[PDB]
C-alpha cells in the first residue's frame, strides 16, 4: 500500500514497476471519480421528480436544491487538493468515495416520507456537494503518479471519464425509477461500496484570475446547464418528460471536452476559446427565439460549446504556465526538461483553485433561473444576464490575449 520509492521521471523505474502501479491506480481512480459526479448532480434528476411523489416546493425551491451541491462543491475543492499529500491517494480515494454513501441513503429515505421538511432536503444537497470536490483530489493524485510528460493523457482520461458521471446518472436514474424515487439514490450504494473496497486494496499511497473566469464561463456553464436544464425544460414544456432526453446533453458536453484540447493544440488555445465564446453568445441568444426541437438543439449546442470551452481553457492554462517556466528557466539558464516538469507541476498545483472558481457557476446558473422565474414569469431575465456575461467573456478574451 505505501510507496517509499517513486521515480516516474526515471524510464528504467517506469518500465520496471512505475507504469504497472500508475496504471492500476488510474483504472481505479477513474470509476471512483465518475461515481462522485453521479452523486454530485443528483438533484438535477431528483428535484424534478420531487413534486410527482407529493412535495409542495416552489419551482425555485427546487432550483435551489439543484444549485447548492455546487456551493459546498466549490468551497471544498481547494481544501480537497491539499488532502492527497497529507493522507495519501489510497486513503483519501477510499474515504472520499465511501462517505458519499451517507447522502445517497438519506435522500433515498427522505423521498418516501411525504412530510419531510425543506430544511432536511437542503442538508442533503450540501452533502451531495462533497462529491463535487472529489475531482480536485483525484486529479492531484493522478498528477503524482504520472511523469510530468505523460500526465496529459492520464489527466485527460481521468477528468474526461470523470465529467461523464452526470451524463451517466441522467441515463440511469430515470430508467431505474420504475422497478420509485429511492432508486435514483439507492442504485449507487452498491457501486460506491464496491469501489471504496477497490481503492482501499488496489490503490497506493505515495510518501491568473482571468483564467479562473474563463473556466467559469466554460465549465461552470456545463455544470450549470447540467443541473438547471431538466428543471427548466419542465417549467417551459410541462407536456414533455425531459428526463428521458436530458442525459444526452451532459454526454455531448463531456465528450466535447476531450476534443476541445485536441482542437486547440491544432489551431490555437486563445483562438478556439475566442471563437467558441462567439457561439456561446449566439446560442445564448437563439434561445430567446424558442420560448421544442429547436429549444433542445440550441441547448444541445450550449452543452457542446461548454465542452470545447473547458477543454480549450485547460490547454490555454497549460500553455500559459509552459511559456512562463520556459522564460524563468532560460534566465536561470537550465534545461527544457526542468521547464517542462515545472510547468506541469504549476498547472497541477493551480488546478485546485481554478476548478473551485469554475465550480461556482453550477450554483449561479440554476439559482439565476430560479430567481428570474420567481420574480418575473420568464427565464428571459437571467437568460439576458447570460448573454451579457458571454459577451463580457468574449471581450475579455480578445482584449487580454488576441
Amino acid at each position, epitope marked *: 500500500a505505501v*510507496i*517509499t*520509492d517513486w*521515480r516516474p521521471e526515471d524510464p*528504467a*523505474f517506469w*518500465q*520496471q*514497476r512505475g507504469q*504497472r502501479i500508475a496504471s492500476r491506480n488510474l483504472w481505479i481512480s477513474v470509476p471512483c471519480l465518475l461515481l462522485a459526479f453521479c452523486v454530485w448532480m443528483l438533484f438535477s434528476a431528483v428535484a424534478v421528480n420531487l413534486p410527482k411523489v407529493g412535495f409542495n416546493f416552489t419551482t425555485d425551491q427546487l432550483f435551489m436544491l439543484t444549485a447548492l451541491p455546487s456551493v459546498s462543491g466549490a468551497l471544498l475543492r481547494v481544501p480537497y487538493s491539499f488532502m492527497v499529500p497529507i493522507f495519501g491517494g489510497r486513503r483519501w480515494t477510499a474515504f472520499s468515495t465511501g462517505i458519499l454513501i451517507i447522502p445517497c441513503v438519506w435522500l433515498g429515505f427522505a423521498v418516501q416520507d411525504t412530510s419531510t421538511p425543506y430544511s432536511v432536503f437542503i442538508i442533503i444537497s450540501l452533502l451531495c456537494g462533497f462529491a463535487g470536490a472529489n475531482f480536485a483530489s483525484s486529479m492531484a493524485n493522478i498528477s503524482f503518479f504520472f511523469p510530468k510528460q505523460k500526465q496529459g493523457g492520464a489527466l485527460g482520461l481521468n477528468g474526461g471519464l470523470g465529467n461523464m458521471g452526470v451524463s451517466v446518472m441522467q441515463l440511469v436514474a430515470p430508467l431505474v425509477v420504475s422497478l420509485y424515487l429511492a432508486n435514483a439514490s439507492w442504485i449507487w450504494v452498491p457501486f460506491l461500496a464496491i469501489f471504496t473496497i477497490a481503492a482501499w486494496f488496489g490503490m497506493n499511497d505515495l*510518501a491568473l484570475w482571468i483564467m479562473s473566469l474563463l473556466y467559469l464561463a466554460t465549465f461552470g456553464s456545463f455544470i450549470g446547464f447540467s443541473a438547471g436544464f431538466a428543471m427548466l425544460s419542465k417549467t417551459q414544456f410541462p407536456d414533455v418528460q425531459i428526463l428521458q432526453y436530458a442525459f444526452f446533453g451532459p454526454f455531448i458536453g463531456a465528450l466535447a471536452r476531450s476534443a476541445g484540447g485536441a482542437l486547440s493544440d491544432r489551431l490555437g488555445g486563445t483562438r478556439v476559446t475566442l471563437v467558441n465564446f462567439i457561439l456561446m453568445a449566439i446560442f445564448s441568444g437563439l434561445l430567446f427565439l424558442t420560448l421544442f426541437m429547436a429549444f433542445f438543439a440550441v441547448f444541445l449546442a450550449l452543452f457542446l460549446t461548454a465542452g470545447l470551452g473547458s477543454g480549450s481553457t485547460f490547454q490555454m492554462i497549460s500553455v500559459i504556465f509552459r511559456k512562463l517556466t520556459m522564460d524563468r528557466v532560460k534566465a536561470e539558464g537550465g534545461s527544457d526538461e526542468r521547464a517542462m516538469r515545472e510547468a506541469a507541476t504549476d498547472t497541477a498545483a493551480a488546478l485546485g483553485f481554478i476548478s473551485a472558481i469554475g465550480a461556482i457557476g453550477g450554483f449561479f446558473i440554476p439559482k439565476a433561473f430560479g430567481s428570474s422565474l420567481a420574480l418575473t414569469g420568464s427565464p428571459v431575465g437571467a437568460m439576458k444576464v447570460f448573454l451579457i456575461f458571454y459577451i463580457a467573456c468574449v471581450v475579455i478574451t480578445w482584449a487580454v490575449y488576441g
Partner: antibody
Amino acid sequence: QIQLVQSGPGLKKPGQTVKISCKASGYSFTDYGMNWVKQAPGKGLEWMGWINTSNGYTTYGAAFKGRFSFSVDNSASTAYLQLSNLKTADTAVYFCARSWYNRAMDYWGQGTSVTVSS
Amino acid sequence: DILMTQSPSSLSVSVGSSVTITCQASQNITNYIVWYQQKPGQAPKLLIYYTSTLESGIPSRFSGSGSGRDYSFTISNLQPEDVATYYCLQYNSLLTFGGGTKLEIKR
C-alpha cells in the same frame, strides 16, 4: 513462498567462462529487478549491477564493465550471471537478490561459490 | 559514485547491550538506505528499508534513522542470534554497500 535458488559451486581456470543462474519463484518474475552481488573471500559485499526484468536491459556498476553479462530467461523465470576471461580476482561467492527499488534486495539467493584456479 | 563509510568495522558487545552502527554517505541519498544482516554461509537478510521501516518478521529490537548524508542503525537488546556482519546500503543513485560491521557477543 518467495525464494531464489542459485546454482551450485564451480571451479574454473583463468581464461575460462562461467555462468551462474538464479531461479525465482512464489512471485511474478517480471515485476521486480534482479541485483547481482559479489563477495570475495574475507572482503565485504559489492554490488555489480542489476537487470530490468521487463526490459531485459542490464546496468553495470563501474568495476563490472567489460567481462560481465546479466541475461534473463522470463519463461524459466530465472536470471543469469556470465563472467568470461576469468581471473584469480573473480573468486567469490555470488549473489542474486531481488529489487532495485522499493525494498532493495529484499530476498537473496543462497549464493554460489566460484573458484578460479589452475 | 556515492561512497559509504560505515562505523565501526567491528565490535564485541555484552548480551542485552545496545549496538549503534553509523553510516555516512558522500552525498545526500534522500532517505534511501537499507540495512542487511549477514550470518556466514547463509545469505543476507534485509532488516530495514527507507531508513526506518522494518521488513515484516524482523523483531522490534532493530531500528534505524537518519537523513541527507548521515544514517544510523541500532540493535537494542542484544541476543546471541544477532551475531553476524551488518551492512548499510545506498540505493539512491546506483547501489553502494558499506564496508560491514562484524558484531561479536561477549560472554
